[PDB]
Structure formats: structure tokens, C-alpha cells
Amino acid sequence: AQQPWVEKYRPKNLDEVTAQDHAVTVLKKTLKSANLPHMLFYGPPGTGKTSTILALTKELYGPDLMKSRILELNASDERGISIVREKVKNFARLTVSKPSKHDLENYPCPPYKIIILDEADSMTADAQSALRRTMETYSGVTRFCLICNYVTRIIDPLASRCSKFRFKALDASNAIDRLRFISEQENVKCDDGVLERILDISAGDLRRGITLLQSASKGAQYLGDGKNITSTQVEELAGVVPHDILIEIVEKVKSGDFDEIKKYVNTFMKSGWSAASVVNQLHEYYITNDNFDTNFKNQISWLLFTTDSRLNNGTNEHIQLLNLLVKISQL
């Protein structure tokens, strides 16, 4: 219990990745062979790209050859054009390490070493342009694995050279087996639909779901009542707005009266909820409703999209929330 549940239950085998079945099967059938292409993993955060690549490397070489045939770089490490031109080029043009008898007999050691460039979308385009022909020339000796969560930052030539493996988002249906397994292993008392709520709140990631489950389990352990974790405790710990406050917001919006909505927004922001969660709740309330006209739904969908983009830019959420509510109120 010296580690959080996120890393304690990190997959150690390729089969342990309970999502992205296509990419995992492709990588396993490649593990049987030696034709490993230059990979490019992308997708939403928490989908399991780093876990997949670490499991693949461990199954390829073994615990002994991690330090010799794996080069991992981050944005924490310096990744200027000089680093790409010298360090990566040198590590690529070096010959592979010498596998031992034990490693060769037990593990399917391939005659190449993998260069893992985590969060590679943060590099400048000049560094990627320098990396292009390094990737192309030494293909027979080294493999490049680019792990970025944004494809568009990666320039066109690298996306052309690298085989692309999209990592699908982990919704309620895909990643319920993992949460059930974690609950069984950790002996976490749970309700019926609590895990579905956890996966619903954790939008397209499993790390957030695991963290929420750990927090709920710790709270239940503190209380010590031996009670199943309800949806209310998880919903509260997740930071999403309760339905009563959302109903009050909708009632204030419907009547108009700019002063009233301004005062209620001031009080609401004093209570301090995350505005992205409020926008998500408003979207799942207004769009799924059937009491609203088509034109209203068009306009409110566009308004919610604009507010979400402006919030994602990293602005002051109070003004954006007030603007969104006032614009909806005048529809």
C-alpha cells in the first residue's frame, strides 16, 4: 500500500490492457514476429498509451534489457533541436546491446531497440524535421514510438512515416471490467450503479475513475460503517454540481432579469464549482430535454460549444459562465 491505486494496478502485461483491442492484438502479433513499425499512439489522456508501451517493452526484452535497449524522453528532459540532432541520432546509430543466454532463451528478444518519445507533441517543428531522416535511415536497427495526445502538433511527414494507433476513449461499456476487478481485489463496498456513475463522470479516462474509487474507498474506511458507497458520495467527491443547484440555475435563467442571474452566479462562484463541469451539466440537461424548440437547441448548442472552447483556452471562468447564462437567458 506504498503506492496510489493508479500506479499499483498499472498493467504489467499486454493482455492486461482491457481496451484498445485492435492495437493490443496488432502489437501482440507483431511481438510474435519481428516486423515492428514506427508506432504513433494517440488519444485522450488516461486511455493507457504509456502503460501499453511499457508492457510491450517489458514483454519484448525483459527486466534485464530495459536499461540497455530503451531510451525514453519527456518534456522534462531537454528536447531542443541540438538534443534531437546529437543524442537521439547517436543512440539510433549505435548497434544493439548483446542479449544474454537467459534473456534469449526466456524472452523473444528482437534485433532492435525502441526509442520512446513521450508527449512528443510539445517538440518544435524543427526538431521533428531533424528527426524525420533519423527515423527513416536507421529503421533496420531502431524503432521510434511517438506518444502524443494531439496528432495535429505532429507534422505531416512523421504521421506519414509512423504507423498510427488511435487509443479509444474508455467509456462505461469499455472499462467496466477493470473497475469491477479493482473493486474485487481491493474489497471496496459498492452500490449497483456507482461504477457506471464513476465512468460517466470520468470523461474518457480510467485514471480518473481509479482515483475517484480510491478516494471513495478511503472515505468509507474513515467512516467505517461497512456501508456500500452510494452514488451521492461519488458524485460529491467528483466535483460535479448537484441537481438542485442546476435546477435553481435553470430557473434563474428562464425568468431573465439580468440582476437576479448575476447575483446567483456571484453566489454560485463563491461556492466554487468548476465551470467546465457546470457547462457539461447544462449541456446534458438542455440538449436531452424535449420541452425546447429546434431553433433554441441550435443556438444553445452553439453557445455551449463557444463557452467550452473559451474555457479550454484557460480564461477567467466567472465571466465566461455569466456570459453563457445571460446569452442562454435571452434566447
Binding site: Y150, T152, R153, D156
Partner: protein, 320 residues
């Protein structure tokens, strides 16, 4: 590996001032300098490929003859023209005592002079002012803006202009008659249109078409070398129907293998160099093209972005 034949660009490079076509007044002035001998300091500027450095070399050859091996010091960007290791070289060369004909001086061809630093030109200022009796300089730069104003204050400004179609056609016909290749006037006008007054481009396209199809007919010319995409971009931006603009975009640029960033930069250049539409309209067009440019440079390069750019350009152009 057989020794390559010299390309027609270099095989038919002029060796005398008479063969240079275009800018008749400048060439006549250079000829009068040549027979007169009193060469002043000059700076030669213009668009690339219209005959700047070849006139300098021809004048240097004509003014001084057998002394060309050591009476002219030629410098270029390949030589490390810096403030320190190079001021001594020109200082020695100007201070070098060589016996010329009475009306001829040493020539320092500082070819591609727009790439030098400020300090090198600052030293060259007094270097030129001191030994004006012995040595004379010849700057040949594509852009004269990089040259500082003290250097412009003691130089003869010789501005070359882009070649007219008649002069390019005349020298092209000379090249055909020396090479005896079957030609059609439509193909020659296609070469002229593709070159855009750039002579070396015309010679290179002539080479490609001759050695690719034997006949320089217009169909073969357009098969080998494509029409200049600035003209296609200008046609696309000036269309009145949005569907027509989108179709031109797709067919002529997206299906011809043109990067989105190239289309955006060419559109910006065409818009800033366009003059038919109102000034303010060009201002909003430039603003929108720049917004699309920022979107392209930030990572998202897609046909959809160019289509949106064209749609908003039509929104501004059609006045809502």
C-alpha cells in the same frame, strides 16, 4: 559515369555586353563605361535571374583583359565575408600595386552584397573612399535595402527591371537557332508565360521540354512544367461564385499536390500585391488569411480550413 554536358544555362551565358537583352539604357550605359574606362562604384539590384551578375562579369572581362586573373577580386556568400578576416583582404588588394592600362582600375566584385553584416559595410565605406583612384567596387544584390545609406551615397545606382516578353523571346529564338530544335510559337509563348520574366527559368524549362519530348509544343510544355500557382491563386481569390472558387482550389491545388501552408502564403502575397479591389477589402482579406495562417501553423492543416478561408473571403467580397 560519362562527363555531363554543360547545361544550356551555363553553355550560352553571354561573354560580351551586346548579348545581354533587356534594360537597353542600362546596357548601353555599361557599354559606354566599358569603352570609356572610367568605371564608378555601382550597386546593381533587381529580381533574380534577369542578368545582374553576368553583366558585372562581362564588364570586368571587357575593361581589363589578360589582367583578369589577378586584377579582379571576386567575393561571394560562399567566401566568409566578415568584418575582421576579410577587411585585410580587400585592404591588401586595394593597396596592391598592379600596372593596368591607363584608363582601367582593379575591380572588387562583392557579389551577393545584401548578405554582408553592418560592420563589414562600415569598414568598406572608408575602404572605398580612400583608394578610389586604384580600385573600384561592384555590388550585385537582389535587394538594395540591406545596403546601408553611406554605401548608397557613394555608388552609382543601376536598377535592372524585369525582362520584357519580346527580349526573352528574341534570345530564346537565338538559342533555338544555335541548337536547331523544332519549335512552335504556342510552345514559346507557353515558356514565356511560365517564366514570368525570369530568364534562367525560361532556359531551364526549355531544357526540360527539349530533353523530355523533343518538341516544345504547348501541350508538352504544360505537361512537363506546371503553370505558376500564384496565377491560379489570384484566379481563385477573384472569382465571384463560392462554388467556383472551391472547385478551383480543390482541382488545381489540392489534387495537384500543393501544401496548405503554400496556398495560404501565396494567397497572402497575392492579396497584398493585388490592386483591383478596394483597399479596405484587401485589409479584411489579409486579416482573415492571416487567421487561417495562424490556424495552419498551429498544427491543423486541412482542406476544411482552406475552404473556410475561401468562404469568409467571399463573405467579405460579396458585402454580406
Amino acid at each position: 559515369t560519362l562527363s555531363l554536358q554543360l547545361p544550356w544555362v551555363e553553355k550560352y551565358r553571354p561573354q560580351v555586353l551586346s548579348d545581354i537583352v533587356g534594360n537597353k539604357e542600362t546596357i548601353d550605359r555599361l557599354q559606354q563605361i566599358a569603352k570609356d574606362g572610367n568605371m564608378p562604384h555601382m550597386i546593381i539590384s533587381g529580381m533574380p535571374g534577369i542578368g545582374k551578375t553576368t553583366s558585372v562579369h562581362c564588364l570586368a572581362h571587357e575593361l581589363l583583359g589578360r589582367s583578369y586573373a589577378d586584377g579582379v577580386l571576386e567575393l561571394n556568400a560562399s567566401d566568409d565575408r566578415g568584418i575582421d578576416v576579410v577587411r585585410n583582404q580587400i585592404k591588401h588588394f586595394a593597396q596592391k600595386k598592379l600596372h593596368l592600362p591607363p584608363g582601367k582600375h582593379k575591380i572588387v566584385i562583392l557579389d551577393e552584397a545584401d548578405s554582408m553584416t553592418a560592420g563589414a559595410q562600415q569598414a568598406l565605406r572608408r575602404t572605398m573612399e580612400l583608394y578610389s583612384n586604384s580600385t573600384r567596387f561592384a555590388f550585385a544584390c537582389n535587394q538594395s535595402n540591406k545596403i546601408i545609406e553611406p554605401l548608397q551615397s557613394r555608388c552609382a545606382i543601376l536598377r535592372y527591371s524585369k525582362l520584357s516578353d519580346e527580349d526573352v523571346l528574341k534570345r530564346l529564338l537565338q538559342i533555338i537557332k544555335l541548337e536547331d530544335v523544332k519549335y512552335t510559337n504556342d510552345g514559346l509563348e507557353a515558356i514565356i508565360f511560365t517564366a514570368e520574366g525570369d530568364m534562367r527559368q525560361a532556359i531551364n524549362n526549355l531544357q526540360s521540354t527539349v530533353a523530355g519530348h523533343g518538341l516544345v509544343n504547348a501541350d508538352n510544355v504544360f505537361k512537363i512544367v506546371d503553370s505558376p500557382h500564384p496565377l491560379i491563386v489570384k484566379k481563385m481569390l477573384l472569382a465571384s461564385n463560392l462554388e467556383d472558387s472551391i472547385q478551383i482550389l480543390r482541382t488545381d491545388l489540392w489534387k495537384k499536390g500543393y501544401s496548405s501552408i503554400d496556398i495560404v502564403t501565396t494567397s497572402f502575397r497575392v492579396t497584398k500585391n493585388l490592386a483591383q479591389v478596394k483597399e479596405s477589402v484587401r485589409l479584411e482579406m489579409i486579416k482573415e488569411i492571416g487567421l487561417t495562417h495562424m490556424r495552419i501553423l498551429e498544427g491543423v492543416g486541412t482542406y476544411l480550413q482552406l475552404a473556410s478561408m475561401l468562404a469568409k473571403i467571399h463573405k467579405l467580397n460579396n458585402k454580406a
